[PDB]
Amino acid sequence: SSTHIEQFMPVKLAQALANSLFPELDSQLRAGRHIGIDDLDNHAFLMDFQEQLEEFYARYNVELIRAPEGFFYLRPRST
Amino acid sequence: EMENVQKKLRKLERDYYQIREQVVSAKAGWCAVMRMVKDNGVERRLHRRE
Amino acid sequence: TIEERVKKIIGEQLGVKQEEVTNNASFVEDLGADSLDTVELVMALEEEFDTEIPDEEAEKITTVQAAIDYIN
Amino acid sequence: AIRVTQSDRDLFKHLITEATSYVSADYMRHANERRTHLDEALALRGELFG
């Protein structure tokens, strides 16, 4: 039906962006910070919504990447 | 009977020539793959005798 | 020539370098050609010069020098 | 820790198994055709000589 979140956005993505952890994390990520296993809160958050975040950031022409060692970071494209 | 049998022999000879040429042509192509798979990719991983 | 047509056949039937194939280079140990590889090598040698070889006299051939010796 | 490693493993295994299944099959097909024609040629050779 109309006026329904699904019209504009996946529910899981909206759920992630509404979380209290997102602004901190976003700010940090943009600044170039790498995220490892020790900062549980952040790491766990990342894990839970990985694909939504990846898809999101894609809008910016930037890859949200996951190294084999389990740490997340941002890699910008030429554009 | 031997002259009649020499005719079967000749049929077999022509067949054998054809097969000979075909086999050699196959080997010529397969050589390139062999030189290319020297990466240790062939010994067990690719050559699954099963 | 025959002494280089033999190399033409051997290198392209075993895939080994022309430098590797010397007169005394044995197929099995130097060139690495195994049972079926040597069978195909002798078949190709037969085809190149459009001749035929006996089974025993052919199997006796196990080297470039021997190959040419039976060929020439 | 688990959650990480388990994932990694799943991806490794799936790629490996499917890629080998995809390649080895046709490699063996080629090897088998060459084997077959060689065998036919040898049978023809022996029968012709005899």
CA distance C7 to C68: 9
CATH 1.10.10.2250 describes domain A5-76: yes
The H or E element that residue A73 is part of is: strand A72-76
The H or E element that residue B5 is part of is: helix B2-36
CATH topology for C1-72 is: 1.10.1200
Chain A nearest CA to D1, separation (Å): 8
Beta-ladder partners of C63: C26
Q: Is the Cβ–Cβ distance between A15 and A56 less than 8 Å?
A: no
Contacts of D30 (CB under 8 A, 6+ apart): B30
* DSSP annotation of B45: I
| Secondary structure in 3-state letters for chain D | CHHHHHHHHHHHHHHHHHHHHHHHHHHHHHHHHHHHHHHHHHHHHHHHHC
Q: Tell me which residue in D38, D46, D49 faces C39 most closely, judged by beta carbons.
A: D38
Q: Tell me which residue in D1, D3, D8 faces A68 most closely, judged by beta carbons.
A: D8
Nearest Cα to Cα of residue B48 among D20, A47, C30 = D20
Q: Which chains touch D (3 or more CB pairs under 8 A)?
A: A, B, C
Q: Is the Cβ–Cβ distance between A74 and A64 less than 8 Å?
A: yes
- Spans of all domains in chain C: 1-72
Chain B nearest CA to D5, separation (Å): 25
